[PDB]
């Protein structure tokens, strides 16, 4: 059967004492006036987001529950039984029999690996709330000496169990009622002796929304701006380029010999799928530091001008490959712009570059007249003159050869051991993109609210055929606010206009909570032919 839950299932959301206050709480609650399933004395009811369980009886007919996923031995299931002496809780691989129900041995046949066990201590109403969040199974409860009653009573915490399992179904171990929880905002009124004596379900109806807006249980006559209606996206789409070839990262990172830092090597990366997961297989403990991005997000973006600069330095100079750093390497060899967007991947290459004898394949410029500008290369060997003399000639006194060799050896300490460095420079300045992460493209949905992703530009709105024409070098259009209002579809290359989803202001006309609970609703700046009416909770 089915019955009305009324205003039941409120539970103390925290462990803090409060008095003479109206507190707002966002949590998994039982919506007011909900349709609860009534069973009489039973089946395996699902676990949606948490359950409110009530039991009107006077004979302890209800003894426990069995939460789990398959409720068989192939998975792990939670077990809770209330034996007259104690309460037993056991998360453990249970081959539950088909009709569990005093001989406790008629519930499950086998109890394989048990990762958690626990033991503890006029009809009556035993209300319970079960939740499963972050591996914790939380239980709140309340007993009341008593169709569910129509009074207010709040449930107190009982136990949080670190059971570490998914719970999708449960069953009552044998009148019991089963309601379900949803994420809701509630306005709870605490008493002077700290008792929750009333609540408002903010999402129940317009009057409740007015009550929560004003933070009061009584509303005076008037018209109140309560919230804004917003059409929710029906579906999501992804539109990335059709390219499928993988980027030539192996020939960069897995190169037999790297360049010298003074003559550092630059490689252009284009027309490819850049899967950065292939990284993380370099000389372990490697440094992967990004500027303007996070390493974990690179796989989800699209890049315009991707360049891989590779060279070898000594370990203690890896700190110098960063914006604004100073030193021989950062001043005469390889400078990064202060506004660098990209990533520096450095890793010890002792077992590739060090030579017992002294490796002279890797040089660095130690003396330069002026510093270098960003991403500039100097491969000249003229003699540096630190003296006023006409040094023009050969080296000598105050006349130094500018390049010096690292002479990497296997016996050096880490600080002077070779490190292979790769700098990935890319412009996330949207623009037409050629390198993109591994991402699947859906179909293009027009004239409909959707979540969209165009080459990494994410948004929500309505896409329509645009009359604007982009120049070949343009991929997005921008408005006065500098928000993207037009986009060229990466695959078909058509121009789409982006418009926000339908939304507007809502006002509630109330004669006064004292006079009545009837309300009228004004959808501001909207005509009725356009007032949202979507049945399911999608609008």
């Amino acid at each position, epitope marked *: 059967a089915y019955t009305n839950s009324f205003t039941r299932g409120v539970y103390y959301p925290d462990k803090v004492f409060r008095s003479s206050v109206l507190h707002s709480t966002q949590d998994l609650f039982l919506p007011f006036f909900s349709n609860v399933t009534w069973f009489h004395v039973n089946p395996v009811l699902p676990f949606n987001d948490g359950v409110y369980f009530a039991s009107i009886e006077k004979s302890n007919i209800i003894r426990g529950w069995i939460f789990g996923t398959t409720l068989d031995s192939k998975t792990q299931s939670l077990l809770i039984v209330n034996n007259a002496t104690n309460v037993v809780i056991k998360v453990c691989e249970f081959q539950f029999c088909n009709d569990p129900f005093e001989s406790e041995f008629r519930v499950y046949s086998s109890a394989n690996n048990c990762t958690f066990e626990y033991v503890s201590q006029f009809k009556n109403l035993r209300e319970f709330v079960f939740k499963n969040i972050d591996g914790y199974f939380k239980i709140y409860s309340k007993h009341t000496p008593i169709d569910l009653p129509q009074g207010f009573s709040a449930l107190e915490p009982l136990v949080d169990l670190p059971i570490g399992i998914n719970i999708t179904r449960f069953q009552t171990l044998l009148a019991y009622y089963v309601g379900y929880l949803q994420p809701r905002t509630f306005l709870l009124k605490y008493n002077e002796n700290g008792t929750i004596t009333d609540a408002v379900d903010c999402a129940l109806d317009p009057l409740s929304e007015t009550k929560c807006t004003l933070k009061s249980f009584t509303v005076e006559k008037g018209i109140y701006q309560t919230s804004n209606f917003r059409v929710q996206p029906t579906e999501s789409i992804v539109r990335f380029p059709n390219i499928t070839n993988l980027c030539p990262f192996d020939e960069v990172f897995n190169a037999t010999r790297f360049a010298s830092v003074y003559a550092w090597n630059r490689k252009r990366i284009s027309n490819c799928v850049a899967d950065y997961s292939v990284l993380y297989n370099l000389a372990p403990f490697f440094t992967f530091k990004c500027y303007g991005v996070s390493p974990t997000k690179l796989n989800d973006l699209c890049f315009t001008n991707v360049y891989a600069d590779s060279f070898v330095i000594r370990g203690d100079e890896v700190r110098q490959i960063a914006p604004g750093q100073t030193g021989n390497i950062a001043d005469y060899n390889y400078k990064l712009p202060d506004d660098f967007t990209g990533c520096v991947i450095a890793w010890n290459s002792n077992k590739l570059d060090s*030579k017992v004898s002294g490796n002279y394949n890797y040089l660095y410029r130690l003396f330069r007249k002026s510093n270098l500008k960003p991403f500039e290369r100097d491969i000249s060997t003229e003699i540096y003159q630190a003296g006023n003399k006409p040094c023009n000639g050969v080296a000598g006194f105050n006349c130094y050869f500018p390049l010096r060799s690292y002479s990497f050896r*296997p016996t050096y300490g880490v600080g002077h051991q070779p490190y292979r460095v790769v700098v990935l420079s890319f412009e996330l300045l949207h623009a037409p993109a050629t390198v993109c992460g591994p991402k699947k493209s859906t179909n293009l949905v027009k004239n409909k609210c959707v979540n969209f992703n165009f080459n990494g530009l994410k948004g929500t709105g309505v896409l329509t055929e645009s009359n604007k024409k982009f120049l070949p070098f343009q991929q997005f259009g921008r408005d006065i606010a500098d928000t993207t209002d037009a986009v060229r579809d990466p695959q078909t290359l058509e121009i789409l206009d982006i418009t926000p989803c339908s939304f507007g202001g809502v006002s509630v006309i109330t004669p006064g909570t004292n006079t009545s609970n009837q309300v009228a609703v004004l959808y501001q700046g909207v005509n009725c032919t356009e007032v949202p009416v979507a049945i399911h909770a999608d609008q």
Partner: antibody, heavy 94, light 106 residues
């Protein structure tokens, strides 16, 4: 794939790999001589100094050199000391 | 340096006979020594480098370890394809020197 034919002085003709990235050695096993990718580390044997000279023509992928002689390719780009220094591909003979 | 001294002059065994091989040297050469394999008539192959990271696609059974001149080749299931004159090759310094040949028998 790698092919190392000991054509022929001796003139090995490399194929199947990037000749410019690896060191090359003659061995007759009585190793004869070695040479690096840029010919910056040319190392001979105790019995050859002044007689045989090793060299390489990277443009044509040739190992030239003024028991049978082999044509091993080094697993790395430079002279003996390296954790990865070895002769991982040979030819046939001469 | 240096003088590789394969110290069996030769060895012999049968299918399933795990056999060990060794060779010595003048000075220390750390791990910069490899072991090749010359099957009769054929040219030498590669088995392992530094005695740890076995060459890819090579039967792991051929293996060994040791520093300086201590080098101990070690198989587990010596088989028809494991009969050949193996060499120890020092690579620490140049002139590079080879061994003389632990020609295995049938």
């Amino acid at each position: 794939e790698v092919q190392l034919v000991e054509s022929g002085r001796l003139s090995c003709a490399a194929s199947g790999f990037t000749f410019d990235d690896y060191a090359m050695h003659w061995v007759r096993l009585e190793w004869v001589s070695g040479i690096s990718w840029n010919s910056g580390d040319i190392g001979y044997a105790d019995s050859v100094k002044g007689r045989f000279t090793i060299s390489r023509d990277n443009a044509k992928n040739s190992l030239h050199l003024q028991a049978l002689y082999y044509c091993a390719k080094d697993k790395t780009y430079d002279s003996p000391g390296y954790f990865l220094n070895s002769f991982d591909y040979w030819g046939q003979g001469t | 340096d240096i003088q590789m001294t394969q110290s069996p002059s030769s060895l012999s065994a049968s299918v399933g006979d795990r056999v060990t091989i060794t060779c010595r040297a003048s000075q220390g050469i750390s791990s910069y020594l490899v072991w090749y394999q010359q099957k009769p008539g054929k040219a030498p192959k590669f088995l392992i480098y530094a005695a740890s990271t076995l060459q890819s696609g090579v039967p792991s059974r051929f293996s060994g370890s040791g520093s300086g001149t201590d080098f101990t080749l070690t198989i587990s299931s010596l088989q028809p394809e494991d009969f050949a004159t193996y060499y120890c090759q020092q690579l620490y310094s140049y002139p590079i020197t080879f061994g003389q040949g632990t020609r295995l028998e049938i």
